[PDB]
Design a protein around this motif. Structure first.
Motif, PDB file in Angstrom:
ATOM      1  N   UNK A 347       0.779  -1.082  -0.121  1.00  0.00           N
ATOM      2  CA  UNK A 347      -0.019  -0.033   0.025  1.00  0.00           C
ATOM      3  C   UNK A 347       0.795   1.134  -0.144  1.00  0.00           C
ATOM      4  N   UNK A 348       1.841   1.356   0.747  1.00  0.00           N
ATOM      5  CA  UNK A 348       2.836   2.392   0.864  1.00  0.00           C
ATOM      6  C   UNK A 348       3.769   2.578  -0.427  1.00  0.00           C
ATOM      7  N   UNK A 349       3.933   1.518  -1.156  1.00  0.00           N
ATOM      8  CA  UNK A 349       4.601   1.586  -2.497  1.00  0.00           C
ATOM      9  C   UNK A 349       3.594   2.236  -3.531  1.00  0.00           C
ATOM     10  N   UNK A 350       2.438   1.715  -3.344  1.00  0.00           N
ATOM     11  CA  UNK A 350       1.359   2.230  -4.303  1.00  0.00           C
ATOM     12  C   UNK A 350       1.127   3.892  -4.137  1.00  0.00           C
ATOM     13  N   UNK A 351       0.938   4.401  -3.136  1.00  0.00           N
ATOM     14  CA  UNK A 351       0.569   5.634  -2.565  1.00  0.00           C
ATOM     15  C   UNK A 351       1.905   6.285  -1.823  1.00  0.00           C
ATOM     16  N   UNK A 352       2.877   6.427  -2.064  1.00  0.00           N
ATOM     17  CA  UNK A 352       3.884   7.155  -1.176  1.00  0.00           C
ATOM     18  C   UNK A 352       3.585   8.266  -0.376  1.00  0.00           C
ATOM     19  N   UNK A 353       2.675   8.939  -0.708  1.00  0.00           N
ATOM     20  CA  UNK A 353       1.931  10.225  -0.118  1.00  0.00           C
ATOM     21  C   UNK A 353       1.341   9.990   0.950  1.00  0.00           C
ATOM     22  N   UNK A 354       1.057   8.652   1.604  1.00  0.00           N
ATOM     23  CA  UNK A 354       0.775   8.338   2.803  1.00  0.00           C
ATOM     24  C   UNK A 354       1.723   8.870   3.882  1.00  0.00           C
ATOM     25  N   UNK A 355       2.879   8.839   3.744  1.00  0.00           N
ATOM     26  CA  UNK A 355       3.647   9.114   4.651  1.00  0.00           C
ATOM     27  C   UNK A 355       3.577  10.538   5.413  1.00  0.00           C
ATOM     28  N   UNK A 356       2.877  11.498   4.399  1.00  0.00           N
ATOM     29  CA  UNK A 356       2.289  12.708   4.878  1.00  0.00           C
ATOM     30  C   UNK A 356       1.544  12.834   6.102  1.00  0.00           C
ATOM     31  N   UNK A 393      13.135  10.619  12.814  1.00  0.00           N
ATOM     32  CA  UNK A 393      14.040  11.706  12.157  1.00  0.00           C
ATOM     33  C   UNK A 393      13.193  12.850  12.095  1.00  0.00           C
ATOM     34  N   UNK A 394      13.250  13.524  10.940  1.00  0.00           N
ATOM     35  CA  UNK A 394      12.590  14.727  10.369  1.00  0.00           C
ATOM     36  C   UNK A 394      11.393  14.484   9.601  1.00  0.00           C
ATOM     37  N   UNK A 395      11.741  14.395   8.125  1.00  0.00           N
ATOM     38  CA  UNK A 395      10.720  13.841   7.325  1.00  0.00           C
ATOM     39  C   UNK A 395      10.268  12.306   7.867  1.00  0.00           C
ATOM     40  N   UNK A 396       8.955  11.980   8.193  1.00  0.00           N
ATOM     41  CA  UNK A 396       8.577  10.767   8.679  1.00  0.00           C
ATOM     42  C   UNK A 396       8.846   9.826   7.064  1.00  0.00           C
ATOM     43  N   UNK A 397       9.207   8.608   7.548  1.00  0.00           N
ATOM     44  CA  UNK A 397       9.369   7.558   6.484  1.00  0.00           C
ATOM     45  C   UNK A 397       8.336   6.397   6.526  1.00  0.00           C
ATOM     46  N   UNK A 398       8.443   5.520   5.375  1.00  0.00           N
ATOM     47  CA  UNK A 398       7.401   4.418   5.369  1.00  0.00           C
ATOM     48  C   UNK A 398       7.541   3.493   6.646  1.00  0.00           C
ATOM     49  N   UNK A 445      -0.110 -17.347   1.314  1.00  0.00           N
ATOM     50  CA  UNK A 445      -0.695 -16.279   0.568  1.00  0.00           C
ATOM     51  C   UNK A 445      -0.604 -14.851   1.183  1.00  0.00           C
ATOM     52  N   UNK A 446      -0.683 -14.418   2.332  1.00  0.00           N
ATOM     53  CA  UNK A 446      -0.807 -13.131   2.770  1.00  0.00           C
ATOM     54  C   UNK A 446       0.535 -12.269   2.273  1.00  0.00           C
ATOM     55  N   UNK A 447       1.581 -13.139   2.253  1.00  0.00           N
ATOM     56  CA  UNK A 447       2.962 -12.386   1.830  1.00  0.00           C
ATOM     57  C   UNK A 447       2.793 -12.055   0.218  1.00  0.00           C
ATOM     58  N   UNK A 448       2.109 -12.597  -0.432  1.00  0.00           N
ATOM     59  CA  UNK A 448       1.836 -12.138  -1.726  1.00  0.00           C
ATOM     60  C   UNK A 448       1.093 -10.633  -1.752  1.00  0.00           C
ATOM     61  N   UNK A 449       0.202 -10.655  -0.964  1.00  0.00           N
ATOM     62  CA  UNK A 449      -0.689  -9.398  -0.669  1.00  0.00           C
ATOM     63  C   UNK A 449       0.244  -8.137  -0.394  1.00  0.00           C
ATOM     64  N   UNK A 450       1.044  -8.285   0.578  1.00  0.00           N
ATOM     65  CA  UNK A 450       1.806  -7.316   1.007  1.00  0.00           C
ATOM     66  C   UNK A 450       2.940  -7.070   0.151  1.00  0.00           C
ATOM     67  N   UNK A 451       3.333  -7.724  -1.078  1.00  0.00           N
ATOM     68  CA  UNK A 451       4.414  -7.642  -1.999  1.00  0.00           C
ATOM     69  C   UNK A 451       5.638  -8.007  -0.934  1.00  0.00           C
TER      70      UNK A 451
END
Length: 559
Positions: A347-356, A393-398, A445-451
Motif C-alpha cells: 500500500x505504501x509503495x503504491x501511494x507514497x504520499x500516505x507518509x504525509x 527523524x525529520x521527514x517521516x518514513x514508510x 498467500x498473505x505474503x503475496x498480498x503485501x508484496x
C-alpha cells in the motif's frame, strides 16, 4: 498466474486422498468423510461441507441464520463447499456463493465420545474475505496430535453485516456473527460424534478471526459454550473491528442502481432482489471521503445493534461488553507478531504520499478523542503524541508509518483490552506471546498480498504458515528451523487448548521457560517471544504502548 498454482494444488490434493471413508452422526443427519494424507505422511479423516444453518438465500438474506433442514441418508462431506461471496483477493473478481454456512471437522481417527480437545478456528479477512478451504487452512499440522479441529465459515461483507434501524424489518446487523454463534452451538451439541469433548472447546482466530473469537467471548449468546480463547493479532476493541453502518445500506443500493429514496423498507426490498455479486463488487466504493479520512476502512462489519432481538450479539459497544463478559473468566492467550505493520508495504509503495499523514498524525487519533474535522487544537495535541512515538527523524518514513500501524491496529487495542478486563474477571489467567520467527522458506498467500517476497520482518499473518498447510507451503526437513516452528506453535496451541496453560516440557526449547500470565499490578508486560529460541521477555512494544495511552491523560474515562 496463481490460477495454475490453484490447479497444481487441486491435483496434489487428489494424490493425498485415500479410498477410505467413514460415516459420522450429526443432529441433522449422517455425514460421510474421507481419510486424507499429508505431505508428511500423517493421515486424518476429513468432513467438509457440514451445514449448521439453512442457506441464507431469498427472504433469508441479511437475516439471522435459521436451523438447517434434517436429512435422511448420508450427506457427502468428502469435498468442500463454496466460500461466502467475496472479491477474490488475487483475481479481483467476485467468487463464492450465498450458500456458504458450513463447517469442516478434522481428526486423525474417528472415536466417538472419547473427549479429545476441540479447537475451533475462525478465519480472518476483515469480515469481507476468507474461507475454510484447505488451500489456506489445511489441518495437516494439527492432526499430528489427538485433537478435533473445526474450521467454520460465516457470512461476509454486506451479506453478513447489513444493518437497518427500522425495527419492523428485523435486520439489526451482525448476521455473520450470528452465524458464528450458530456454529459454536452446533459444535457444542455435535463434537462428541467426532470424538471431541464438549466440555473442553477452544476457540481461536487471527486478525478478524481474533476479533470474532473475542466477540464470541463477549456476547451473552455464547455464554459457557467454550472453555479457552486465543486472540491472534486482534480483538473486538480494535478500531477496524466495528463500525456504525446503518446509513450505508442506502449508499450501497444507490451504487447498485436503486431508484428509490432513503427508507429502510424500500432499500431492503431492492437489496433482497439484487444479485449478490453486484452488491459485493460495489462494497469497496461505499465509504465516503470523510469516513476514509477518519480511518473507517470497511463499510460493513460488526456493529452495535440499534434495538434488541432474541438473537442480538452486540447490544452495546464491545468496550462496554467487556465489563460483563462471560469470556473474561476463561483461560485466554493473546499475542501479535514482531512487525505487524509490514502488512502495509505494498500500500505504501503504491501511494507514497500516505507518509504525509505522519506530519501531524491527526487521522490516527482514536475516533472517540477526535473531532470530525480533525482540526481541533486538542486533536493536534493528541496527534503530536502519536508522532513522537513513531517518527524517528525529520521527514517521516514508510517504516515509521508501518511501525505506527502495528500499534494503532494491534498493540494498543491489546493493551486497552488487558487494562479494561482486569477491572472485571474472576482472576482467570491471560498469557501473552510475540511471534518473532522470520523465514521466507515457508510462506502463505498473505505474503503475496503485501508484496513481501524478499522482505525481512515478521508481518501480520506470517505465523499462519506454522499452523495450517496452504497451497504455497512445501514439505520442510525435520531438522529445519521451519519444521521446528510448526511443532512449537501447534504444540503450544494444543497444550493451551488441553489445560488452559500454554507451557509444556515436551516442546523442544520450552523446558526452561517460566511463562506467567499478566497480573493487574504489572507495569511492563512479559511475553513468550517465539524466534529460533523460546524466551520470556519484556514486550519490546511497551514504551510505545504507554505513549499511546498518554493520549487519554485528559480523557481517562474513555481509556
Amino acid at each position: 498466474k496463481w490460477k495454475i498454482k490453484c490447479i497444481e494444488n487441486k491435483f496434489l490434493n487428489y494424490r493425498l486422498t485415500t479410498s477410505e471413508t467413514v460415516v459420522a452422526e450429526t443432529e441433522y443427519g449422517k455425514v460421510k468423510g474421507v481419510k486424507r494424507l499429508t505431505v508428511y505422511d500423517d493421515s486424518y479423516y476429513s468432513f467438509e461441507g457440514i451445514p449448521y444453518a439453512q442457506p441464507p438465500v431469498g427472504e433469508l438474506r441479511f437475516k439471522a441464520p435459521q436451523r438447517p433442514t434434517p436429512w435422511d441418508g448420508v450427506r457427502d462431506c468428502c469435498n468442500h463447499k463454496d466460500k461466502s461471496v467475496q472479491v477474490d483477493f488475487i483475481t479481483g473478481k467476485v467468487c463464492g456463493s450465498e450458500d456458504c454456512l458450513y463447517l469442516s471437522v478434522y481428526t486423525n481417527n474417528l472415536n466417538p465420545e472419547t473427549k479429545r480437545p476441540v479447537l475451533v478456528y475462525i478465519h480472518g479477512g476483515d469480515f469481507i474475505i476468507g474461507e475454510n478451504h484447505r488451500d489456506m487452512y489445511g489441518p495437516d499440522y494439527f492432526i499430528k496430535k489427538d485433537v478435533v479441529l473445526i474450521n467454520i465459515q460465516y457470512r461476509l461483507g454486506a451479506l453478513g453485516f447489513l444493518s437497518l434501524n427500522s425495527e419492523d424489518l428485523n435486520v439489526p446487523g451482525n448476521a455473520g456473527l450470528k452465524d458464528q454463534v450458530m456454529a459454536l452451538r452446533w459444535i457444542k451439541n455435535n463434537c462428541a460424534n467426532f470424538g471431541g469433548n464438549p466440555d473442553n472447546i477452544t476457540v481461536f482466530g487471527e486478525s478478524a478471526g481474533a476479533a470474532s473469537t473475542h466477540y464470541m467471548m463477549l456476547t451473552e449468546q455464547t455464554r459457557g459454550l467454550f472453555h479457552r480463547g486465543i486472540l491472534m493479532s486482534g480483538n473486538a476493541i480494535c478500531p477496524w473491528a466495528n463500525t456504525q453502518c446503518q446509513h450505508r445500506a442506502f449508499t450501497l443500493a444507490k451504487l447498485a442502481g436503486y431508484k428509490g429514496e432513503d427508507n429502510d423498507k424500500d432499500v431492503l426490498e431492492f437489496l433482497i432482489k439484487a444479485k449478490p455479486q453486484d452488491l459485493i463488487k460495489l462494497e469497496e466504493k461505499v465509504l465516503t471521503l470523510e469516513e476514509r479520512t477518519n480511518m473507517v476502512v470497511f463499510p460493513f462489519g460488526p456493529t452495535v445493534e440499534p434495538y434488541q432481538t432474541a438473537d442480538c450479539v452486540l447490544p452495546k459497544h464491545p468496550r462496554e461488553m467487556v465489563k460483563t463478559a462471560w469470556g473474561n473468566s476463561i483461560p485466554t492467550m493473546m499475542g501479535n507478531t514482531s512487525y505487524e505493520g509490514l502488512f502495509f508495504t505494498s500500500i505504501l509503495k503504491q501511494m507514497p504520499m500516505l507518509v504525509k499523514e505522519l506530519e501531524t498524525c491527526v487521522n490516527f487519533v482514536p475516533s472517540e478523542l477526535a473531532d470530525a474535522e480533525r482540526t481541533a487544537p486538542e486533536t493536534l495535541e493528541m496527534g503530536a503524541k502519536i508522532k513522537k512515538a513513531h517518527v524517528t527523524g525529520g521527514t517521516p518514513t514508510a517504516d515509521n508509518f508501518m511501525d505506527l500501524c502495528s500499534h494503532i491496529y494491534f498493540w494498543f487495542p491489546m493493551h486497552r483490552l488487558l487494562q479494561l478486563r482486569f477491572n472485571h474477571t474472576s482472576g482467570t489467567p491471560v498469557y501473552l506471546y510475540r511471534f518473532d520467527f522470520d523465514s521466507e522458506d515457508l510462506i502463505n498467500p498473505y505474503r503475496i498480498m503485501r508484496s513481501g517476497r524478499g522482505v525481512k520482518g515478521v508481518s501480520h499473518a506470517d505465523e499462519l504458515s506454522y499452523f495450517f498447510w496452504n497451497q504455497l507451503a512445501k514439505r520442510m526437513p525435520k531438522e529445519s528451523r521451519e519444521y521446528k516452528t510448526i511443532e512449537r506453535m501447534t504444540g503450544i496451541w494444543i497444550q493451551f487448548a488441553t489445560t488452559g496453560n500454554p507451557y509444556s516440557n515436551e516442546i523442544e526449547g520450552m523446558e526452561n521457560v517460566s511463562w506467567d500470565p499478566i497480573k493487574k499490578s504489572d507495569e511492563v508486560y512479559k511475553c513468550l517471544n517465539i524466534s529460533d529460541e523460546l524466551k520470556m521477555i519484556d514486550v519490546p512494544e511497551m514504551d510505545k504502548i504507554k505513549q499511546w495511552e498518554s493520549m487519554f491523560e485528559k480523557h481517562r474515562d474513555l481509556f
